[PDB]
Chains A and B, each alone.
Chain A
Amino acid sequence: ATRHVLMRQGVLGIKVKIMRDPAKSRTGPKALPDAVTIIEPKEEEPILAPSVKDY
């Protein structure tokens, strides 16, 4: 946004730029284009004994 303030010496321009947070968007893209997030795999122990559960 841009404004012209009319003082007694002359016009004072006022620019304002606001970068909103992409996470709080709720409408459209939630992140910047090159944001990549790899989800951490939940780590579990190797079984080393073959078993069958039954029903």
Chain B
Amino acid sequence: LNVLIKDKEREERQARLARVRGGTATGGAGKKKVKGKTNLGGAFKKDQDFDLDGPDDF
């Protein structure tokens, strides 16, 4: 049931911030920005040095 609650709130949160053009509710008035996520890959879990260095960058 708790998972149901969490998922439902997630879907509703999509709906409210559909109308509002930018980031968080109230937009540019808000003073609070919308955060993003760091795509780490698998680099830093149980942190160490990286044996697999990348030769070239797209």
The chain A residues found within 8 Å of chain B, CB to CB, are 5-9, 12
Distance in angstroms from A3 CB to nearest chain B CB is 13
We find that the number of chain B residues with CB closer than 8 angstroms to chain A is 5
Distance in angstroms from A2 CB to nearest chain B CB is 18
B37 at the binding interface (Cβ < 8 Å) = yes
Is chain A's interface secondary structure helix, strand, loop, or mixed overall?
A: strand
Distance in angstroms from B36 CB to nearest chain A CB is 6
Give me 7 other A-B pairs in contact (C-beta within 8 A), A7-B35, A9-B38 excluded: A6-B33, A6-B35, A6-B36, A7-B36, A7-B38, A8-B37, A12-B38
Chain A residues within an 8 Å CB radius of B38: 7, 9, 12
